[PDB]
Design a protein around this ligand. Structure first.
Ligand SMILES: Cc1noc(-c2ccnc(-c3ccnc4[nH]ccc34)c2)n1
Length: 167
């Protein structure tokens, strides 16, 4: 039993809710919140900009030190950093950005990072400003992630389309 509330169950291990991931993180304090990161951990907009804003820029400060030490992530890769006031940990995962021409097949590799964590609160990778089809992203999530994932979808209209079209 966990504290996630109001989710629709899609499969054995995948759950979905129309929610603001920032507000959901603030209420649940999950062990892991996933950020929709880029390779530079520059949290300017989308989910990343919202999560970072909610940490009063502490996420960005920590991220800049991470990059200065380690260099950029790989597309499809991830790193574990602090969850600050939102979660114990933040798993920064880099899905391909279609608006940069990155290979959508890397989306499966990106979701594989979730399997290193038993339970996660997450957005749909490569959705939103990353330019992928969120319905495709949901399909790859369900077919790749085996651990327990709670998907927060900000847009109510999109949430309804994802549920209604789910196979
Ligand atoms: C601009 C832009 N382009 O894409 C997106 C996107 C993609 C996936 N999930 C989200 C999302 C999901 C749940 N809560 C959220 N709070 C703030 C963002 C967010 C946003 N934003």
């Amino acid at each position: 039993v966990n504290s996630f509330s109001g989710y629709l169950k899609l499969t054995d291990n995948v759950y979905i809710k129309n929610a603001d991931i920032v507000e959901e993180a603030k209420k649940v304090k999950p062990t892991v919140v996933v950020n929709a990161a880029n390779v530079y951990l520059k949290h300017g907009g989308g989910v990343a900009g919202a999560l970072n804003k909610a940490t009063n820029n502490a996420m960005q400060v920590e991220s800049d030190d991470y990059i200065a030490t380690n260099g950029p992530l790989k597309v499809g890769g991830s790193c574990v950093l602090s969850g600050h006031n939102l979660a114990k940990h933040c798993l920064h995962v880099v899905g391909p950005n279609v608006n940069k021409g990155e290979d959508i097949q890397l989306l499966k590799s990106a979701y594989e990072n979730f399997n290193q964590h038993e339970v996660l609160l997450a957005p749909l990778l490569s959705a939103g400003i990353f330019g992928a089809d969120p319905i495709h992203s949901l399909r790859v999530c369900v077919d790749t992630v085996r651990t327990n994932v709670y998907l927060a979808v900000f847009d109510k209209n999109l949430y309804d389309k994802l549920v209604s079209s789910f196979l």
